[PDB]
Amino acid sequence: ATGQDRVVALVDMDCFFVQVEQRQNPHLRNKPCAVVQYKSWKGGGIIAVSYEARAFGVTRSMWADDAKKLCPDLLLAQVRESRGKANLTKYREASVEVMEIMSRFAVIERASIDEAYVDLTSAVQERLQKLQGQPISADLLPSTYIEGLPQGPTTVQKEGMRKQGLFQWLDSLQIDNLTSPDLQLTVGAVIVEEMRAAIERETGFQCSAGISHNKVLAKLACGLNKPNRQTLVSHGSVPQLFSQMPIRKIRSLGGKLGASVIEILGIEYMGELTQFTESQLQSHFGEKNGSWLYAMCRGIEHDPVKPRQLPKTIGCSKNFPGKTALATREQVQWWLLQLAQELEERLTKDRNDNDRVATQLVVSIRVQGDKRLSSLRRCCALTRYDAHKMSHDAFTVIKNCNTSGIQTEWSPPLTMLFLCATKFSAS
DNA sequence: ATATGACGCT
DNA sequence: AGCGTCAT
Numbered sequence: 001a002t003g004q005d006r007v008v009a010l011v012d013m014d015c016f017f018v019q020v021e022q023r024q025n026p027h028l029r030n031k032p033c034a035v036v037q038y039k040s041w042k043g044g045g046i047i048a049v050s051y052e053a054r055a056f057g058v059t060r061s062m063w064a065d066d067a068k069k070l071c072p073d074l075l076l077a078q079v080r081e082s083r084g085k086a087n088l089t090k091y092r093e094a095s096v097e098v099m100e101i102m103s104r105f106a107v108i109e110r111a112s113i114d115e116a117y118v119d120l121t122s123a124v125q126e127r128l129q130k131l132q133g134q135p136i137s138a139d140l141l142p143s144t145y146i147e148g149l150p151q152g153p154t155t156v157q158k159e160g161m162r163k164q165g166l167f168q169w170l171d172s173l174q175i176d177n178l179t180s181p182d183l184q185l186t187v188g189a190v191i192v193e194e195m196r197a198a199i200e201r202e203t204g205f206q207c208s209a210g211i212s213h214n215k216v217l218a219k220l221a222c223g224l225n226k227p228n229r230q231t232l233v234s235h236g237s238v239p240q241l242f243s244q245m246p247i248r249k250i251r252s253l254g255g256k257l258g259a260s261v262i263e264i265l266g267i268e269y270m271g272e273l274t275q276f277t278e279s280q281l282q283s284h285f286g287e288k289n290g291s292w293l294y295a296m297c298r299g300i301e302h303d304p305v306k307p308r309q310l311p312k313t314i315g316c317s318k319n320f321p322g323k324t325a326l327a328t329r330e331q332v333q334w335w336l337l338q339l340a341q342e343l344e345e346r347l348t349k350d351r352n353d354n355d356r357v358a359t360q361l362v363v364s365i366r367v368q369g370d371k372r373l374s375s376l377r378r379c380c381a382l383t384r385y386d387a388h389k390m391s392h393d394a395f396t397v398i399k400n401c402n403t404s405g406i407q408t409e410w411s412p413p414l415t416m417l418f419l420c421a422t423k424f425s426a427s
Numbered sequence: 428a429t430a431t432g433a434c435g436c437t
Numbered sequence: 438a439g440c441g442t443c444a445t
């Protein structure tokens with residue numbers, strides 16, 4: 001048993017949307033900025049935030065007019081909004097630049113607009129053989145941080161720290177035994193400096209990464225050292241790091257389950273999960289959660305890097321909160337249309353680029369009096385890439401919710417509308 | 428009154 | 438198929 005079988009990495013762009021705005025507005029470069037969505041209610045919900053604006057304390061979800069309370073220098077690059085909602089075309093088109101690069105190395109799995117898991121297992125056996133045993137040098141890793149080094153019997157500069165830390169790791173390394181989990185992790189951490197350096201080469205976009213043995217730890221190390229650096233995380237640094245690591249951090253456990261993992265066990269850290277055996281664990285969460293949250297605090301997860309760049313489900317959403325809420329037949333046709341037209345714009349730019357037709361179409365709504373993000377999923381075969389079809393397709397599918405005799409309006413007002421095309425074909 | 432996309436379960 | 442959960 002090891003869980004050091006694979007080598008897996010998680011690259012991720014340092015404040016992506018800011019970087020995409022900055023490559024057209026040079027005034028934004030080396031300046032503390034955010035990126036705002038719409039512009040009326042509190043100036044617009046801030047989604048992306050530069051790192052110079054973070055050092056004044058500006059957060060996402062925060063409302064533009066409220067960071068302009070925290071941040072005077074907050075040169076605010078507005079998101080392009082179109083058809084009344086969002087238009088994220090600047091970025092979804094950049095994101096597809098960045099993932100072309102990363103696949104020149106290993107077959108990755110798209111994980112966000114801005115990040116991608118990548119399995120480097122095969123290509124590590126590529127480089128390791130290309131080595132006759134020629135030890136790996138520091139120069140090859142100009143920006144890699146080694147979790148848990150330096151140490152033992154022991155400058156102040158953050159970047160001298162990084163040298164004498166990289167320098168310890170390499171010296172204790174079995175450059176011959178091509179099977180050591182810390183020699184494969186280490187070749188792999190090169191493919192990623194070369195991956196990430198060629199990104200900023202071909203895009204001007206800056207990335208950070210994280211490189212352990214599974215995917216939950218690749219992420220946990222991506223965001224250790226940021227921005228513009230990587231971090232290898234050894235299966236031996238795992239017990240160290242995991243010990244002060246909050247359960248709420250780990251991918252899956254950020255939510256309701258997290259609390260129960262914490263509450264039901266009486267815990268606050270990943271490392272304290274070690275003491276409960278697996279079938280022991282399974283009795284409080286399930287047959288799959290115990291099998292998982294056991295080997296997790298042992299830095300063993302076996303979620304595979306699922307080979308996928310072009311996603312599934314093309315989707316287009318628009319909220320109508322509070323006083324906006326649509327209560328009118330005529331409204332819920334125009335918004336359905338304007339939603340059905342951006343889908344039309346996205347779905348074509350799919351079909352030529354990616355060789356697939358979606359056959360499904362999922363309408364959703366929310367009502368002025370529900371908390372659930374969605375209060376009704378309803379579905380109907382997408383046959384033709386027509387807005388006016390999809391628009392009128394989608395009214396038939398939902399009309400049967402208007403609790404009214406007033407067919408002049410809508411009872412009760414809708415606070416959300418969502419069109420999503422799933423079940424792509426081979427076109 | 429913060430727009431997307433995935434997945435496990437039923 | 439639809440809904441809850443979770444991540445960004």
Ligand SMILES: Nc1ncnc2c1ncn2[C@H]1C[C@H](O)[C@@H](COP(=O)(O)NP(=O)(O)OP(=O)(O)O)O1
Nearest residue numbers: 012013014015016017018047048060113114226445
């Ligand atoms: N709650 C949210 N809602 C909508 N969009 C969001 C979002 N959070 C992030 N984004 C959008 C905006 C973001 O530009 C994009 C990816 O942002 P991140 O992966 O969350 N973190 P970033 O790459 O920005 O910087 P760093 O990694 O150093 O934290 O997704």
Ligand SMILES: [Mg+2]
Nearest residue numbers: 012112114115
């Ligand atoms: Mg991210």
